[PDB]
Amino acid sequence: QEISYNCDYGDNTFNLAIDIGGTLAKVVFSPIHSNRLMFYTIETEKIDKFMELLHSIIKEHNNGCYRMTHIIATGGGAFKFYDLLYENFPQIKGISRFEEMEGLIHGLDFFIHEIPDEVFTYNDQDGERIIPTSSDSKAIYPYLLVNIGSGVSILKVTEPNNFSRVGGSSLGGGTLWGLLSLITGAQTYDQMLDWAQEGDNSSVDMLVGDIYGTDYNKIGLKSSAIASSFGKVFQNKLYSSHESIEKNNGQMFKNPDICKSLLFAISNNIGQIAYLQAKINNIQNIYFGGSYTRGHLTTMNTLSYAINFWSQGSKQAFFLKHEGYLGAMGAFLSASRHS
Amino acid sequence: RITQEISYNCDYGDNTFNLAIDIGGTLAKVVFSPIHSNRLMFYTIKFMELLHSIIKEHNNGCYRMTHIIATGGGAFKFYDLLYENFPQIKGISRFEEMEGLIHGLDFFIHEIPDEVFTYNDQDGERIIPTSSIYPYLLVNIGSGVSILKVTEPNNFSRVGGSSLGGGTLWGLLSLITGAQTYDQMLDWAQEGDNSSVDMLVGDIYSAIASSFGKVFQLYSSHESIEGQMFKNPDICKSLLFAISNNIGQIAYLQAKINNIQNIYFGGSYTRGHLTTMNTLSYAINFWSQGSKQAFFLKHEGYLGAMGAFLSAS
Ligand SMILES: CN(C)c1cc(CN2CCOCC2)nc2nc(NCc3ccc(C(C)(C)C)cc3)nn12
């Protein structure tokens, strides 16, 4: 989903930035004199596949010129994969590392300030609205980045170059993916999202309605609000697997319903934690980064609604067209300055 | 057979057998006192059938001298069912759930010795002599989580909550592992090693980076997608940590927003399990750098029924 941008190509080094996380590798590069920023994601699980993509990019977009390629690695996996990269690319110009936080924030601020049609709000009522951020300091800052990958990172940015980590969560995309993979057999994240879309969570969640007979207006909750995620399930050997889960249980619980339930559980939790962090830090604007929302309308509506609800309208969820690429973009910009 | 009991000089001015019931999503709790016994009797659970036996055994089968106070959603969802089930009773009344919990908690704090305690694996159990306070948070964990702020006697509000509560833990672990009781889940959790299903920091580069994050790792023309197995004990530990750490974090953030140091954990979640208590205590101790404190309660599951009981008189 390439972007037009006038890059400074410097000494013509080909800068190949990689953000390596728990689960995914996200790559940003610009062929020399193209003025195009290009973006790819691949799972890290099959090393050959990952390394092979990097090889193909060098061959297809830098004419096989290893000796003028600089790989800059960011994300948590920059450390773990450093030796794999070195052994794969003996003949390249260099390999460097960029701190994860600076990566995310440099990448995000770049997207906010420079790239049109990149930042957007979304909910089921309003549809998508592009926020024209790449048109000052006091309008943009302060903000929070909620970067959802395997876990959840939360960073606050008070002004240019002024940013820090605040507490994150271990209940992130990896949790949602792990649980639904094992429970439902779903083969890909995209499949889980399609099943979630069709599902009815109320068959496995207890709603306020199920516990009361009605709204619980004294505490601000409608009957349709979720009171206990997966709360309906209990009432109704060393190892478990999808197989055993299916043999034991059949279709008492339906896959679409499980997917929607847990999509709501994890996204609402993330939205709440984000809210609470924004509340403590007196921040109105909350960006979502990572590869969790993937422009999925249900997911974005869920997150937007959680921030809106918990804040009673005083805070706002923002999404990014290149959400997954913030870290790699920041690394890219560092290597660019260098060359 | 009642095995949980407190001596207390109850007020029997009305010459009524007060029977308080907390009808929550998943569990039902009773608090009652045989007239003039000075014994408070507690029971957690075919339920309506229990209430009958209680009247039979502890009030001589006398319906016309029994008063029921109902708290929780059942009280409203099923107000009629109580009248259908308990005709000819002296009276049925209701008590609002949040107010139930706080009156019950304040009673345990102020009146009952050896009720409030800290627990962690480092220093063990410490009884806090509260009965010898404000403001405080109550984090009441049942099917879901209710979080209440209490500034002073009779000043409180529900500030927050979470749908990721005991029912989520029990639900996930039932379906995934086939475990049949909360007890088996906790026993398995205590043996388990979460690192086989969780991505830890070390995995990305013993803190958890992603709970359960290691698990994900046209027409038919090749082999069946068919698969990988994970150990039940490790799954129970992963999800116990995930749900407990999250609750601890939300509790800490709420406490921070509300400028509260003292955080009480209520409901039927910890059940006196050292591992669960340790995890909650650790989470609060960690985030606050020691400036906030987790408290537990010997009668954690009966806060709401206790408050309802006291409302009768
Ligand atoms: C997910 N939403 C939208 C929210 C929002 C809030 C706080 N809001 C702040 C803004 O003003 C309105 C209130 N609290 C929430 N708690 C839950 N579930 C836990 C839960 C809900 C209900 C119950 C009973 C019925 C048994 C008492 C027990 C546990 N969800 N939830």
XYZ file of C-alpha atoms and ligand atoms in Angstrom:
683
model
C 0.000 0.000 0.000
C 2.747 2.286 -1.221
C 2.923 6.017 -0.544
C 4.263 8.795 -2.718
C 6.950 10.772 -0.914
C 9.992 12.735 -2.001
C 12.844 11.004 -0.265
C 16.372 12.208 0.164
C 18.417 9.340 -1.326
C 21.774 10.579 0.002
C 24.733 8.408 -1.132
C 22.126 6.040 -2.666
C 22.362 3.367 0.059
C 19.232 1.172 -0.103
C 17.682 1.331 3.344
C 15.648 -1.732 4.249
C 13.949 -1.243 7.635
C 12.484 -4.223 9.469
C 10.314 -4.166 12.603
C 10.418 -7.682 14.047
C 7.895 -8.442 16.771
C 6.718 -11.541 18.638
C 4.649 -12.662 15.613
C 5.158 -10.441 12.538
C 7.959 -8.764 10.552
C 7.071 -5.471 8.893
C 9.344 -4.095 6.166
C 9.629 -0.544 4.798
C 11.883 0.459 1.871
C 12.163 2.923 -1.050
C 13.862 1.894 -4.373
C 16.456 4.539 -5.245
C 14.906 7.652 -6.924
C 11.451 6.055 -6.902
C 9.922 8.497 -4.375
C 7.787 5.536 -3.349
C 7.578 4.109 0.161
C 6.698 0.420 0.047
C 5.447 -1.884 2.850
C 5.221 -5.634 3.401
C 4.393 -7.905 6.339
C 5.308 -11.563 6.778
C 5.135 -13.963 9.730
C 8.486 -14.647 11.374
C 7.667 -18.316 11.917
C 9.205 -19.624 8.672
C 12.666 -17.992 8.771
C 13.415 -19.129 5.229
C 10.242 -17.313 4.068
C 11.094 -14.125 5.959
C 14.754 -14.078 4.871
C 13.669 -14.996 1.364
C 11.376 -11.944 1.133
C 14.270 -9.665 2.113
C 16.391 -11.339 -0.572
C 13.674 -10.815 -3.224
C 13.248 -7.168 -2.260
C 17.005 -6.540 -2.702
C 16.888 -8.388 -6.090
C 13.631 -6.863 -7.351
C 13.973 -3.289 -6.058
C 17.706 -2.663 -5.600
C 18.883 -4.605 -8.666
C 20.626 -7.270 -6.574
C 22.975 -4.743 -5.047
C 23.713 -6.215 -1.598
C 26.810 -4.089 -1.101
C 24.799 -0.894 -0.993
C 21.981 -2.274 1.200
C 21.644 -1.270 4.809
C 19.274 -3.322 6.964
C 18.035 -1.526 10.095
C 16.145 -3.731 12.549
C 13.703 -2.505 15.193
C 10.958 -4.062 17.327
C 11.593 -6.491 20.199
C 12.990 -9.094 17.758
C 15.815 -6.833 16.486
C 18.017 -8.407 19.187
C 16.902 -12.024 18.794
C 17.224 -12.051 14.968
C 20.428 -10.059 14.654
C 22.530 -13.198 14.089
C 20.057 -14.674 11.596
C 20.271 -11.459 9.583
C 24.076 -11.367 9.660
C 24.379 -14.985 8.512
C 21.832 -14.374 5.737
C 23.379 -11.158 4.461
C 27.220 -11.551 4.687
C 27.776 -9.140 1.763
C 25.654 -6.113 2.678
C 26.759 -2.577 3.564
C 25.633 -2.811 7.195
C 23.096 -3.978 9.795
C 22.092 -1.672 12.635
C 19.450 -1.564 15.377
C 17.027 1.150 16.335
C 15.339 1.359 19.744
C 11.701 0.236 19.576
C 10.115 3.275 21.259
C 11.975 5.868 19.176
C 11.069 3.781 16.141
C 7.325 3.785 16.881
C 7.199 7.466 17.730
C 9.428 8.683 14.963
C 7.341 6.638 12.547
C 4.032 7.811 13.946
C 4.957 11.509 14.016
C 6.173 11.179 10.452
C 2.816 9.665 9.357
C 0.824 12.326 11.276
C 2.757 15.315 9.917
C 3.712 14.274 6.383
C 1.349 11.682 4.931
C -2.132 12.692 3.653
C -5.232 10.514 4.166
C -3.350 8.449 6.739
C -5.115 9.289 10.049
C -8.826 8.535 10.408
C -11.665 8.134 12.896
C -14.158 5.242 12.418
C -17.468 4.114 13.933
C -20.579 2.352 12.603
C -22.684 5.559 12.846
C -20.279 8.084 11.316
C -18.302 5.951 8.883
C -14.654 6.835 8.241
C -13.449 10.430 8.538
C -9.947 11.396 7.344
C -8.274 13.730 9.820
C -6.073 16.258 7.910
C -3.118 16.183 10.333
C -0.457 16.691 7.700
C -1.792 20.255 7.233
C 0.517 22.872 14.656
C 2.106 21.574 17.888
C -0.854 22.289 20.144
C -3.370 20.571 17.839
C -1.447 17.265 17.581
C 0.138 16.841 21.023
C -0.191 15.432 23.562
C -1.233 11.963 22.353
C -1.102 8.323 23.327
C -0.004 5.498 21.064
C -1.574 2.120 21.843
C 0.562 -0.238 19.829
C -1.123 -3.657 19.684
C 1.036 -6.614 18.537
C 1.555 -9.805 20.568
C 1.164 -7.726 23.754
C 0.113 -4.067 24.036
C 2.544 -1.127 24.317
C 1.324 2.285 25.443
C 3.506 5.330 24.849
C 2.686 8.972 25.548
C 4.017 11.800 23.433
C 3.765 15.254 24.946
C 5.551 17.208 22.190
C 8.178 16.624 19.439
C 10.996 14.403 20.765
C 9.337 14.060 24.140
C 7.900 10.593 24.684
C 7.892 7.774 27.214
C 6.428 4.347 27.913
C 3.496 3.977 30.327
C 2.272 0.576 31.489
C 1.028 -1.776 28.720
C -0.832 -5.094 28.859
C -0.109 -8.766 28.184
C -3.672 -9.212 26.738
C -3.068 -8.248 23.136
C -3.385 -9.568 19.611
C -1.360 -12.653 20.555
C -3.905 -13.441 23.269
C -6.862 -13.026 20.928
C -5.052 -15.059 18.226
C -3.785 -17.750 20.650
C -7.186 -18.381 22.274
C -9.243 -18.400 19.072
C -6.685 -20.476 17.186
C -6.833 -23.189 19.872
C -10.574 -22.948 20.574
C -12.065 -22.490 17.106
C -9.429 -23.994 14.805
C -9.420 -20.721 12.830
C -6.434 -20.873 10.461
C -5.712 -17.131 9.988
C -6.421 -13.842 11.804
C -8.464 -12.676 8.795
C -10.648 -15.796 9.158
C -11.141 -15.116 12.880
C -12.272 -11.597 12.014
C -14.728 -12.870 9.390
C -16.192 -15.344 11.912
C -16.327 -12.598 14.562
C -18.274 -10.403 12.127
C -20.985 -13.017 11.656
C -21.184 -14.060 15.298
C -23.494 -13.376 18.221
C -21.447 -12.985 21.459
C -24.573 -13.166 23.645
C -24.645 -16.955 23.344
C -21.462 -17.227 25.451
C -21.348 -13.820 27.228
C -23.629 -12.785 30.075
C -25.097 -9.379 29.355
C -26.334 -6.942 31.965
C -29.763 -7.940 30.604
C -29.093 -11.607 31.490
C -28.248 -10.773 35.092
C -30.786 -7.997 35.689
C -33.929 -8.026 33.692
C -33.243 -4.639 32.246
C -30.960 -1.620 32.059
C -28.938 -0.994 35.186
C -29.284 2.728 34.870
C -27.837 3.595 38.321
C -24.382 2.358 37.098
C -24.633 3.623 33.480
C -25.038 0.295 31.622
C -27.663 -0.836 29.080
C -29.069 -4.354 29.151
C -26.997 -5.195 26.082
C -23.637 -4.253 27.713
C -21.337 -7.209 28.443
C -21.085 -8.066 32.162
C -19.021 -11.242 31.836
C -17.081 -12.252 28.736
C -17.493 -16.046 28.232
C -19.622 -15.977 31.394
C -22.225 -18.345 29.926
C -19.698 -21.047 29.142
C -18.771 -22.736 32.428
C -22.319 -23.568 33.564
C -23.009 -25.219 30.198
C -5.440 -35.730 30.862
C -2.345 -33.581 30.520
C -2.816 -32.041 27.076
C -5.544 -30.139 25.236
C -5.757 -29.319 21.568
C -8.277 -28.011 19.088
C -9.048 -31.683 18.446
C -9.836 -32.515 22.135
C -11.769 -29.287 22.535
C -13.972 -30.355 19.628
C -14.416 -34.017 20.607
C -15.410 -33.019 24.143
C -17.797 -30.231 23.246
C -19.129 -30.607 19.686
C -21.009 -27.454 18.609
C -22.577 -26.497 21.908
C -20.615 -23.321 21.370
C -20.433 -21.894 17.862
C -17.204 -20.611 16.372
C -18.570 -17.195 15.137
C -19.991 -16.530 18.609
C -16.714 -17.428 20.383
C -14.807 -15.187 17.934
C -17.056 -12.156 18.455
C -17.081 -12.679 22.245
C -13.326 -12.678 22.536
C -12.831 -9.961 19.957
C -15.116 -7.831 22.158
C -13.405 -8.961 25.392
C -9.848 -8.114 24.288
C -10.705 -4.933 22.380
C -12.856 -3.535 25.207
C -10.071 -4.306 27.677
C -7.507 -2.537 25.459
C -9.921 0.409 24.986
C -10.398 0.660 28.782
C -6.683 0.445 29.644
C -6.046 3.099 26.964
C -8.805 5.220 28.472
C -7.417 4.910 31.993
C -3.907 5.800 30.804
C -5.267 8.801 28.859
C -7.270 9.825 31.969
C -4.130 9.768 34.246
C -2.101 11.690 31.610
C -4.923 14.088 30.659
C -4.712 13.144 26.998
C -7.645 13.488 24.612
C -6.266 11.803 21.483
C -5.529 8.080 21.357
C -3.883 6.445 18.345
C -4.087 2.720 17.606
C -1.005 1.162 15.974
C 0.133 -2.419 15.230
C -1.572 -5.089 13.109
C -4.636 -5.617 15.246
C -7.388 -3.522 13.629
C -6.361 -4.146 9.963
C -9.082 -1.712 8.788
C -11.757 -4.122 10.091
C -14.951 -2.178 10.731
C -16.204 -4.246 13.677
C -12.847 -4.053 15.438
C -12.476 -0.289 14.874
C -16.061 0.352 15.948
C -15.429 -1.701 19.092
C -12.291 0.251 20.029
C -13.800 3.648 19.152
C -16.901 2.874 21.184
C -14.936 1.766 24.247
C -12.902 5.025 24.300
C -16.083 7.043 23.678
C -18.044 5.213 26.353
C -15.473 5.161 29.156
C -14.657 8.850 28.485
C -18.331 9.821 28.094
C -17.332 11.567 24.842
C -14.228 13.427 26.053
C -11.650 11.188 24.301
C -11.264 9.941 20.699
C -9.837 6.835 18.998
C -7.660 7.425 15.903
C -6.659 4.729 13.392
C -3.840 4.664 10.860
C -3.806 3.333 7.285
C -0.208 2.124 7.895
C -0.815 1.121 11.551
C 1.442 -1.913 11.317
C 4.394 0.014 9.955
C 5.086 2.719 12.570
C 8.272 1.143 14.001
C 9.730 0.190 10.631
C 8.985 3.686 9.251
C 10.871 5.260 12.189
C 13.848 2.946 11.676
C 13.693 3.793 7.946
C 13.876 7.516 8.658
C 16.906 7.052 10.942
C 18.845 5.148 8.291
C 17.804 7.761 5.685
C 19.197 10.642 7.775
C 22.395 8.602 8.209
C 22.891 8.036 4.459
C -24.629 -28.572 57.045
C -23.392 -25.071 57.928
C -19.633 -25.009 58.441
C -19.154 -21.216 58.130
C -20.331 -19.194 61.100
C -19.644 -16.008 63.065
C -20.654 -15.162 66.633
C -22.304 -11.769 66.671
C -24.893 -10.123 68.933
C -27.555 -9.710 66.238
C -30.609 -7.515 66.619
C -33.781 -9.638 66.883
C -36.187 -6.866 67.877
C -38.560 -7.850 65.034
C -38.637 -11.510 66.121
C -38.041 -12.381 62.452
C -35.852 -15.034 60.764
C -33.935 -12.829 58.291
C -32.671 -14.741 55.294
C -30.510 -12.715 52.904
C -29.680 -14.050 49.444
C -27.255 -12.732 46.831
C -28.447 -14.034 43.456
C -25.463 -13.376 41.137
C -25.082 -14.604 37.535
C -23.248 -17.767 38.565
C -23.298 -18.198 42.297
C -25.890 -17.818 45.043
C -24.922 -16.856 48.595
C -27.075 -16.898 51.746
C -26.545 -15.086 55.057
C -28.988 -15.841 57.832
C -29.324 -16.039 61.610
C -31.683 -18.301 63.612
C -33.730 -15.916 65.736
C -31.925 -15.216 69.061
C -28.949 -17.516 68.207
C -26.323 -14.732 67.918
C -24.878 -16.908 65.109
C -24.412 -15.555 61.549
C -24.465 -18.451 59.121
C -23.044 -18.353 55.610
C -23.552 -20.609 52.617
C -22.612 -20.625 48.930
C -24.228 -22.820 46.295
C -31.777 -26.513 43.435
C -31.292 -23.170 45.218
C -34.934 -22.335 45.987
C -34.794 -25.889 47.342
C -31.911 -24.859 49.694
C -33.903 -21.880 50.976
C -36.731 -24.291 51.875
C -34.373 -26.548 53.845
C -32.906 -23.523 55.642
C -36.370 -22.404 56.777
C -37.174 -26.025 57.732
C -33.957 -26.645 59.730
C -33.125 -23.187 61.100
C -36.568 -21.613 61.579
C -38.638 -24.675 62.525
C -40.407 -24.705 59.138
C -42.165 -21.400 59.970
C -42.735 -19.450 56.711
C -44.856 -16.731 58.307
C -41.934 -15.669 60.547
C -39.404 -15.612 57.653
C -38.300 -12.471 55.831
C -36.229 -12.762 52.647
C -33.917 -9.897 51.555
C -32.735 -10.385 47.960
C -29.695 -8.703 46.440
C -28.018 -8.980 42.959
C -29.670 -9.254 39.516
C -31.821 -12.274 40.442
C -33.707 -9.964 42.860
C -35.052 -8.101 39.797
C -34.842 -10.649 37.000
C -36.731 -12.963 39.397
C -38.679 -10.837 41.932
C -41.878 -12.714 41.020
C -40.152 -16.093 41.162
C -39.392 -15.429 44.802
C -43.090 -14.732 45.501
C -44.021 -17.798 43.492
C -41.522 -19.880 45.434
C -41.975 -18.420 48.904
C -45.702 -17.791 49.285
C -46.958 -17.060 52.748
C -43.582 -15.626 53.911
C -43.630 -12.687 56.304
C -42.061 -10.420 53.692
C -39.695 -10.209 50.717
C -37.598 -7.117 50.290
C -34.690 -6.094 48.071
C -31.361 -4.374 48.532
C -29.434 -2.612 45.765
C -26.303 -4.577 44.838
C -23.633 -1.859 45.072
C -25.022 -0.634 48.390
C -25.243 -4.261 49.563
C -21.513 -4.810 48.876
C -20.359 -1.661 50.687
C -22.556 -2.075 53.744
C -21.361 -5.699 53.969
C -17.694 -4.793 53.520
C -17.877 -1.917 56.041
C -19.408 -4.394 58.541
C -16.589 -6.931 58.104
C -13.985 -4.128 58.331
C -15.392 -2.456 61.446
C -17.057 -5.285 63.418
C -15.442 -8.659 62.712
C -11.927 -9.584 64.026
C -9.430 -11.542 61.924
C -11.429 -10.746 58.733
C -9.129 -8.427 56.754
C -5.705 -9.689 55.707
C -2.774 -9.145 53.395
C -1.149 -12.115 51.653
C 1.971 -12.549 49.538
C 4.379 -15.423 49.017
C 7.264 -13.417 50.584
C 5.845 -12.572 54.013
C 2.701 -14.789 54.155
C -0.583 -13.725 55.762
C -0.965 -10.637 57.944
C -4.216 -9.928 59.750
C -4.979 -6.213 59.623
C -6.745 -5.210 62.915
C -9.293 -2.913 61.200
C -11.932 -3.819 63.790
C -9.777 -2.622 66.748
C -9.547 2.842 56.415
C -11.153 5.478 54.112
C -11.065 6.120 51.220
C -10.836 2.648 49.707
C -11.533 0.783 46.505
C -13.530 -2.415 46.460
C -12.790 -4.652 43.483
C -15.582 -7.163 43.544
C -14.785 -10.095 41.254
C -17.586 -12.471 40.253
C -18.773 -13.316 36.788
C -17.577 -9.803 35.845
C -15.751 -7.151 37.905
C -17.327 -4.206 39.732
C -15.020 -1.506 41.133
C -16.451 0.792 43.814
C -14.944 3.860 45.459
C -15.821 4.502 49.085
C -14.863 7.899 50.525
C -16.658 7.541 53.876
C -19.503 5.585 55.618
C -22.459 5.847 53.163
C -20.530 7.694 50.493
C -19.662 5.433 47.538
C -20.146 4.945 43.774
C -19.338 2.353 41.085
C -16.420 3.978 39.236
C -15.627 1.182 36.847
C -15.711 -2.463 35.936
C -14.503 -5.138 33.524
C -16.168 -8.013 31.727
C -12.928 -10.067 32.135
C -13.789 -11.592 35.512
C -14.172 -14.977 37.248
C -16.670 -16.175 34.616
C -14.164 -15.458 31.858
C -11.500 -17.478 33.651
C -13.905 -20.347 34.460
C -15.471 -20.229 30.968
C -12.158 -20.297 29.076
C -10.650 -23.037 31.233
C -13.765 -25.248 31.190
C -13.983 -25.189 27.379
C -10.250 -25.473 26.743
C -9.173 -28.004 29.365
C -12.409 -29.795 30.366
C -11.799 -28.883 34.043
C -15.021 -29.486 35.994
C -14.623 -27.208 39.053
C -12.836 -23.959 40.015
C -10.839 -26.213 42.353
C -9.396 -28.399 39.621
C -8.437 -25.268 37.644
C -6.563 -23.853 40.639
C -4.797 -27.136 41.417
C -3.673 -27.376 37.787
C -2.638 -23.706 37.814
C -0.365 -24.276 40.817
C 1.603 -27.064 39.021
C 1.729 -25.265 35.672
C 4.429 -23.295 33.886
C 2.853 -20.453 31.872
C 5.988 -20.106 29.753
C 4.910 -22.908 27.422
C 1.900 -20.914 26.228
C 2.903 -17.314 26.990
C 5.445 -15.187 25.194
C 7.733 -13.830 27.898
C 9.988 -10.801 27.448
C 12.929 -13.186 26.992
C 11.037 -14.902 24.137
C 10.664 -11.605 22.284
C 14.265 -10.460 23.040
C 10.122 -13.682 33.716
C 7.653 -10.906 32.817
C 4.820 -11.827 30.432
C 4.781 -9.974 27.080
C 1.796 -11.785 25.528
C -0.583 -14.042 27.439
C -1.209 -17.214 25.367
C 0.874 -15.607 22.613
C 2.941 -18.757 21.904
C -0.201 -20.746 21.075
C -0.912 -19.245 17.610
C 2.625 -20.298 16.571
C -10.163 -22.979 -3.644
C -10.436 -26.705 -2.841
C -8.581 -29.524 -1.104
C -5.322 -30.469 -2.875
C -2.791 -31.148 -0.091
C -2.405 -32.642 3.377
C -4.980 -31.890 6.079
C -4.471 -28.766 8.210
C -5.551 -31.256 10.943
C -2.966 -30.382 15.707
C -0.476 -28.926 18.217
C -1.101 -29.692 21.936
C -0.596 -27.661 25.126
C -0.478 -28.744 28.762
C -3.606 -28.178 30.897
C -1.635 -27.034 34.028
C 0.274 -24.484 31.958
C -2.913 -23.227 30.292
C -4.519 -22.813 33.710
C -1.525 -20.865 35.012
C -1.348 -18.641 31.894
C -5.015 -17.696 32.103
C -5.069 -17.306 35.878
C -2.122 -14.877 35.524
C -3.688 -13.134 32.520
C -7.076 -12.498 34.215
C -5.586 -11.744 37.629
C -2.821 -9.425 36.350
C -5.343 -7.529 34.242
C -7.748 -7.066 37.167
C -4.766 -5.944 39.340
C -3.724 -3.409 36.666
C -7.244 -1.949 36.185
C -7.592 -1.785 39.999
C -4.262 0.051 40.284
C -5.123 2.536 37.504
C -8.574 3.257 39.032
C -6.879 3.689 42.457
C -4.409 6.113 40.888
C -7.189 8.162 39.202
C -9.132 8.239 42.475
C -6.116 8.873 44.773
C -6.783 5.695 46.794
C -4.100 3.627 48.608
C -6.300 0.841 49.987
C -7.677 -1.802 47.604
C -9.991 -4.547 48.844
C -10.683 -7.608 46.702
C -14.171 -9.105 47.049
C -16.280 -11.805 45.363
C -15.749 -15.547 44.860
C -12.507 -15.296 42.889
C -9.512 -15.634 45.217
C -11.161 -18.259 47.465
C -8.148 -18.097 49.802
C -5.888 -19.576 47.087
C -2.302 -18.394 47.839
C -1.328 -18.249 44.174
C -4.271 -16.049 43.205
C -3.865 -13.776 46.200
C -0.127 -13.507 45.535
C -0.729 -12.507 41.897
C -3.222 -9.754 42.819
C -0.974 -8.484 45.662
C 2.069 -8.532 43.408
C 0.278 -6.602 40.635
C -0.767 -3.826 43.087
C 2.648 -3.780 44.809
C 4.477 -3.677 41.426
C 2.531 -0.925 39.687
C 2.417 1.306 42.798
C 6.065 0.707 43.666
C 4.789 -0.322 47.130
C 2.639 2.747 47.702
C -0.691 0.878 47.368
C -1.903 -2.224 49.265
C -4.099 -5.189 48.319
C -6.430 -6.424 51.113
C -8.298 -9.744 51.147
C -11.367 -10.853 53.120
C -12.100 -14.122 54.916
C -15.781 -13.646 53.934
C -15.068 -12.145 50.484
C -18.031 -13.846 48.754
C -20.669 -12.683 51.241
C -20.227 -8.891 51.192
C -23.531 -8.321 49.343
C -25.594 -10.844 51.329
C -24.146 -9.453 54.587
C -25.157 -5.918 53.597
C -28.666 -7.149 52.698
C -28.946 -9.033 55.994
C -28.103 -5.818 57.917
C -30.671 -3.866 55.889
C -33.483 -5.881 57.490
C -32.710 -4.336 60.886
C -17.911 -2.495 28.892
N -18.549 -1.330 29.484
C -19.136 -0.540 28.415
C -18.405 -0.969 30.864
C -18.275 0.273 31.379
C -18.141 0.381 32.862
C -17.966 1.757 33.492
N -18.696 2.925 32.886
C -17.866 4.173 32.913
C -18.572 5.288 32.155
O -19.885 5.507 32.680
C -20.660 4.299 32.658
C -20.045 3.166 33.475
N -18.168 -0.633 33.692
C -18.294 -1.855 33.134
N -18.321 -3.038 33.701
C -18.463 -3.950 32.685
N -18.557 -5.285 32.916
C -18.425 -5.663 34.307
C -19.753 -5.722 35.006
C -20.913 -5.111 34.522
C -22.103 -5.240 35.248
C -22.160 -5.971 36.433
C -23.436 -6.125 37.289
C -24.711 -5.954 36.488
C -23.542 -7.456 38.025
C -23.356 -5.076 38.385
C -20.971 -6.547 36.890
C -19.786 -6.427 36.189
N -18.526 -3.346 31.514
N -18.397 -2.022 31.783
